[PDB]
């Protein structure tokens, strides 16, 4: 449910609320970053149809789009590197019910962005005999923006059980500024399931990249929002 | 750690004396009026300055509109009740809603409707139901209970909004609401045989307990109590009444404190 | 109204234990409204618990496993988890509610947050290092798995070899939880035997030979 | 089903002779809100009267308080209330105890 967006520096960004009720009289907007505490940024009042901000924020930094029947939207201007984070809409039905939220990352230089390459590694013959379980490994390499969503699909259906993905990636170049990343994921299933050739396994990485509005001036292909994937079949 | 209570009262009367209005609504934070709206002014305005200091005008605008609608609904409801009861002339219709935070820790919420001062319909927030006292009230119970969403709205307001409203109100007027003024206790002598009066006066929190006891032993309900009344300056007062040579003491408990006066 | 502080640092605990989260509020109100909220790795923002001086109410998902110690004299609002489960590893924040207008217009103030990691209990460790088959043919993958929660993973010595950290996966059908760590490199002198030489390797680690 | 009101006359402060004080008349427990209330000085109405705002009770009754500034002298004697529940306007005397 959580949405995600990658943007360049100096551009504007659009965020949509994900709440049980689309329209609320007062709708609040909070920002979360890894180190700092969550802070309220503003809240929209429908009766006065105006935004109420907090201290220390410019009046021409954020604004709101209020559709009659749709979920309200918040728009940010002049994106700075310190604006990266995750934004949540909130309301007060019984307590402060925060929405699914949306992640936002912004980058100064648009020539440093690369899409990830996805590879799938099949289980070892040693594990299949030592233990009755089988482990498939997914590796995504060479992506600069840490804005990816990884999923596993078995027989055409997304699987949530027996799958582990580390919460944070590692730097491909540990000492270089604006360095590319790498991420790993693991799926474990019964050896009976893996030995069946009928079963199809796929690792899908949703990469959040440039939009159609962004202009590309490089020899490489456009790092557009895409889905990279790798697949494998059962092998007795 | 004291029982505070937010309440809203609405009252209507059919064919009243032309001096008396037709509909009136008044709020209470600690039994002293906080707000007032009537059909003559058709405007909700505060009756306490500190509440007006900390509230935006749009609140008054919204609730003025809502109370206009509620006045119209109140009038039509009273007319329907008169039609059902075959009552002609002048009768009364009252509604009381609100919540209480008690000193023992428990919290309560209530919403009741009364006709001619007699109980007509009481809400049950835990059962989300209506207890009716009559078949005429049973008809209204059946009509209202159909709207589940409105009943859930009332219950959630009584359990999540009224308490919050009290929480902000007790801080907006903390000087006038959370203040404490100690009482002044005096003993009076004075038809052949007379008793000694124990009197307290000048306490803002109306919670007061008074007892007589001789050398640590209380009296067996022979203490003729007296009613508690307000002084008019924002304080209250009370009195109590209880030959042989016996020593007696008057014990009085106010908010937080127990004090004894000896003879 | 001004500040809320979380004194307890981020901690790693084991399943089945009791954990306490510390929080101190600096309020002006006499009966403040305090809240405990959590953020999961999937970034879900859900209400955990609510308390005032008089009352205490929790979320539906807690299921009696969550409690709060609210002591007024010490200004303390502590979270207690008597049974802890791996489904609770998350970042916890404590907040206070400030009223300024309509109740729907209030604000929540949060602490910096405490990160709690619930390691699983591996009853029968089988520490094993495997070499995964190179499907589609530019790296080779070594996997270390089935070790107890006490063993801690450390980074590699050479910068040309990439090693990840711990990972906990729960087979729901078999109700079986396992730990894992991945390693890869590009140099031709790279093998799974020396992959985790820079970490505290258990003595009973399986090192299978090419079958 | 109407209940007759309850009258209570007293003094704001301990009544000493020749001192400024406030006489209080507290009427409670009347269902109809249309009432007539007067304060009496030597059996005559005091026109320098003051009162609080009409209030509500949780038992569907009402209460009110009337007051004024005066000086008590033992020569002077000190509520007159008329209601629909009352056949005649009833009078209450001040006990000064």
From Swiss-Prot, chain B:
Disulfide linkage: 99-162, 198-250
Localization of this protein: Cell membrane; Endoplasmic reticulum membrane; Golgi apparatus membrane; Early endosome membrane
Keyword Disulfide bond: yes
Residues annotated to bind 5-(2-oxoethylideneamino)-6-(D-ribitylamino)uracil: 10, 25, 44, 95, 153-154
Post-translational modification: N-glycosylated.
Source organism, top-level taxon: Eukaryota
Stated consequence of mutating residue 51 to P: Markedly decreases expression at the cell surface likely due to protein misfolding
UniProt KW Signal keyword: yes
One of the record's GO cellular component terms: endoplasmic reticulum membrane
GO molecular-function terms, A-Z: beta-2-microglobulin binding; MHC class I receptor activity; T cell receptor binding
Region called Antigen-binding cleft, residue ranges: 2-180
Impact noted for substituting residue 122 to V: In allele MR1*03
Chain residue ranges for the region called Alpha-2: 89-180
Reported regulation of activity: Inhibited by pterin-based metabolites such as 6-formylpterin (6-FP, a product of folic acid photodegradation). 6-FP competitively inhibits MAIT cell activation by 5-OP-RU. Modulated by commonly prescribed anti-inflammatory drug metabolites. Inhibited by salicilates such as 3-formylsalicylic and 5-formylsalicylic acids. Activated by diclofenac and/or its hydroxy metabolites.
Residues at which 7-hydroxy-6-methyl-8-(1-D-ribityl)lumazine binds: 10, 25, 44, 95, 153-154
Membrane-topology annotation of the record: Single-pass type I membrane protein
Tissue specificity annotation: Ubiquitous. Low expression is detected in peripheral blood B cells, T cells, monocytes and in bronchial epithelial cells (at protein level). Expressed in plasmablasts or plasma B cells in the lamina propria of ileum, appendix and colon (at protein level). Highly expressed on a subset of CD45-positive CD3-positive thymocytes (at protein level).
GO biological process: antigen processing and presentation of exogenous antigen; antigen processing and presentation of peptide antigen via MHC class I; defense response to Gram-negative bacterium; defense response to Gram-positive bacterium; immune response; innate immune response; positive regulation of T cell mediated cytotoxicity directed against tumor cell target; T cell differentiation in thymus
Task performed by this protein: Antigen-presenting molecule specialized in displaying microbial pyrimidine-based metabolites to alpha-beta T cell receptors (TCR) on innate-type mucosal-associated invariant T (MAIT) cells. In complex with B2M preferentially presents riboflavin-derived metabolites to semi-invariant TRAV1.2 TCRs on MAIT cells, guiding immune surveillance of the microbial metabolome at mucosal epithelial barriers.
Similarity comment text for this entry: Belongs to the MHC class I family.
Domain notes: The alpha-1 domain is a structural part of antigen-binding cleft.
Protein name in UniProt: Major histocompatibility complex class I-related protein 1
Protein source organism: Homo sapiens (Human)
Swiss-Prot record, chain D:
Ig-like C1-type domain: residues covered: 5-92
GO molecular function annotation: identical protein binding; MHC class II protein complex binding; peptide antigen binding; protein homodimerization activity; structural molecule activity
Glycan attachment sites: 1, 19, 41, 48, 58, 90, 93
Subcellular location: Secreted; Cell surface
Example GO BP: negative regulation of neurogenesis
Keyword Transmembrane: no
Disulfide bonds: 25-79
Modified residues (Pyrrolidone carboxylic acid): 2
Keyword field: Amyloid, Amyloidosis, Disease variant, Disulfide bond, Glycation, Glycoprotein, Immunity, Immunoglobulin domain, MHC I, Pyrrolidone carboxylic acid, Secreted, Signal
Post-translational modification: Glycation of Ile-1 is observed in long-term hemodialysis patients.
Keyword Ribosomal protein: no
GO terms for cellular component: cytosol; early endosome lumen; early endosome membrane; endoplasmic reticulum; endoplasmic reticulum lumen; ER to Golgi transport vesicle membrane; external side of plasma membrane; extracellular exosome
Record's subunit section: Heterodimer of an alpha chain and a beta chain. Beta-2-microglobulin is the beta-chain of major histocompatibility complex class I molecules. Polymers of beta 2-microglobulin can be found in tissues from patients on long-term hemodialysis. B2M alone (not in complex with HLA-I) interacts with M.tuberculosis EsxA (ESAT-6) and an EsxA-EsxB (CFP-10) complex; the tripartite complex can be detected in the host endoplasmic reticulum. The B2M-EsxA complex can be detected in patients with pleural tuberculosis and is stable from pH 4.0 to 8.0 and in the presence of 2M NaCl.
Function according to Swiss-Prot or TrEMBL: Component of the class I major histocompatibility complex (MHC). Involved in the presentation of peptide antigens to the immune system. Exogenously applied M.tuberculosis EsxA or EsxA-EsxB (or EsxA expressed in host) binds B2M and decreases its export to the cell surface (total protein levels do not change), probably leading to defects in class I antigen presentation.
Disease per record: Immunodeficiency 43: A disorder characterized by marked reduction in serum concentrations of immunoglobulins and albumin, and hypoproteinemia due to hypercatabolism. Patients may suffer from recurrent respiratory tract infections and severe skin disease. Amyloidosis, hereditary systemic 6: A form of hereditary systemic amyloidosis, a disorder characterized by amyloid deposition in multiple tissues resulting in a wide clinical spectrum. AMYLD6 is mainly characterized by gastrointestinal and cardiac symptoms. Neurologic involvement, sicca syndrome, and carpal tunnel syndrome may also be present. Inheritance is autosomal dominant.
Similarity remark: Belongs to the beta-2-microglobulin family.
Annotated protein name in UniProt: Beta-2-microglobulin
Lineage: Eukaryota, Metazoa, Chordata, Craniata, Vertebrata
Gene that produces this protein: B2M
């Amino acid at each position: 449910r959580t949405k995600s967006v990658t943007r360049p520096t100096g551009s504007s960004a659009v965020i949509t609320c994900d709440l049980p009720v689309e329209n609320a009289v007062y709708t609040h907007w909070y920002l979360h970053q890894e180190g700092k505490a969550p802070q309220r940024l503003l809240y929209y009042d429908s009766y006065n149809s105006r935004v109420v901000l907090e201290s220390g924020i410019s009046r021409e930094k954020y604004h709101t789009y209020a559709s009659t029947g749709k979920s309200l939207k918040f728009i940010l201007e002049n994106l700075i590197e310190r604006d990266s984070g995750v934004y949540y809409c909130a309301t007060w039905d019984y307590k402060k019910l925060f929405g699914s939220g949306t992640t936002l990352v912004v980058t100064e230089d648009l020539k440093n962005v690369f899409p990830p390459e996805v590879a799938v590694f099949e289980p070892s013959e040693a594990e299949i005999s030592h233990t009755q379980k089988a482990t498939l490994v997914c590796l995504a390499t060479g992506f600069y923006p840490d804005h990816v969503e990884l999923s596993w699909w078995v027989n055409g259906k997304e699987v949530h059980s027996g799958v582990c993905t580390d919460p944070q990636p590692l730097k491909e170049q540990p000492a270089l500024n604006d360095s590319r990343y790498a991420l790993s994921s693991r799926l474990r299933v019964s050896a009976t399931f893996w030995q069946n050739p009928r079963n199809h396994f796929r690792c899908q990485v949703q990469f959040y990249g440039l939009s159609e509005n962004d202009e590309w001036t490089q020899d490489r292909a456009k790092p557009v929002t895409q889905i990279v994937s790798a697949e494998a079949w059962g092998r007795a | 750690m004291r029982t505070h209570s937010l309440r809203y009262f609405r009252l209507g009367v059919s064919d009243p004396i032309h001096g008396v209005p037709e509909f009136i609504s008044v709020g209470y934070v600690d039994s002293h009026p906080i707000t007032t709206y009537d059909s003559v002014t058709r405007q909700k305005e505060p009756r306490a300055p500190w509440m007006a200091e900390n509230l935006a005008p749009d609140h008054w605008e919204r609730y003025t509109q809502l109370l206009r609608g509620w006045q119209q609904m109140f009038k039509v409801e009273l007319k329907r009740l008169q039609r059902h009861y075959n009552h002609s002339g002048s009768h009364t219709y009252q509604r009381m809603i609100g919540c209480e935070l008690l000193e023992d820790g428990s919290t309560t919420g209530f919403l009741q409707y009364a006709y001619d001062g007699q109980d007509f319909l009481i809400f049950n927030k835990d059962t989300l139901s209506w207890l009716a006292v009559d078949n005429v009230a049973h008809t209204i119970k059946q009509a209202w209970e159909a709207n589940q969403h409105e009943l859930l709205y009332q219950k959630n307001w009584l359990e999540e909004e009224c308490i919050a409203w009290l929480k902000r109100f007790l801080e907006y007027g903390k000087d006038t609401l959370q203040r404490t003024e100690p009482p002044l206790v005096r003993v009076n002598r004075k038809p052949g045989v007379t008793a000694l009066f124990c009197k307290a006066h000048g306490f803002y929190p109306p919670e007061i307990y008074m007892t007589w006891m001789k050398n640590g032993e209380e009296i067996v309900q022979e203490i003729d109590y007296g009613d508690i009344l307000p002084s008019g300056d924002g304080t209250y007062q009370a009195w109590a009444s209880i030959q042989s040579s016996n020593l007696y003491s008057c014990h009085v408990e106010h908010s937080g404190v127990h004090m004894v006066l000896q003879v | 109204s001004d500040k809320v502080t979380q004194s307890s640092p981020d901690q790693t605990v084991a399943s089945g234990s009791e954990v306490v989260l510390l929080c101190t509020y600096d309020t002006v109100y006499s009966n403040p409204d305090l809240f405990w909220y959590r953020i999961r790795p999937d970034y879900s923002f859900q209400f955990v618990f609510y308390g005032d001086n008089s009352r205490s109410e929790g979320a539906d998902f807690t299921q009696g496993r969550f409690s709060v110690k609210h002591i007024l004299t010490q200004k303390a609002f502590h979270l207690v988890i008597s049974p802890v489960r791996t489904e609770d590893s998350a970042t916890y924040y404590c907040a206070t509610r400030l009223w300024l207008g309509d109740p729907h217009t209030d604000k929540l103030i949060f602490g910096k947050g405490t990160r709690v990691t619930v390691e699983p209990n591996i009853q029968n460790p089988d520490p094993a290092v495997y070499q995964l088959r190179d499907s589609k043919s530019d790296k080779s993958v070594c996997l270390f798995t089935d070790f107890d929660s006490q063993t801690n993973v450390s980074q590699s010595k050479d910068s040309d070899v990439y090693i990840t950290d711990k990972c906990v996966l729960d087979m729901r059908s078999m109700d079986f939880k396992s730990n894992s760590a991945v390693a890869w490199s590009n140099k031709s002198d790279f093998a799974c035997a020396n992959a985790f030489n820079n970490s505290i390797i258990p003595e009973d680690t399986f090192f299978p030979s090419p079958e | 089903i109407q209940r007759t009101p309850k009258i209570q006359v007293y003094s704001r402060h301990p009544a000493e002779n020749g001192k400024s004080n406030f006489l209080n008349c507290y009427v409670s427990g009347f269902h109809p809100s249309d009432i007539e209330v007067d304060l009496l000085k030597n059996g005559e109405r005091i026109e320098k009267v003051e009162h609080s705002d009409l209030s509500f009770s949780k038992d569907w009754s009402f209460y009110l308080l009337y007051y004024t500034e005066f000086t008590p002298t033992e020569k002077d004697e000190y509520c007159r209330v008329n209601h629909v529940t009352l056949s005649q306007p009833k009078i209450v005397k001040w006990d000064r105890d």
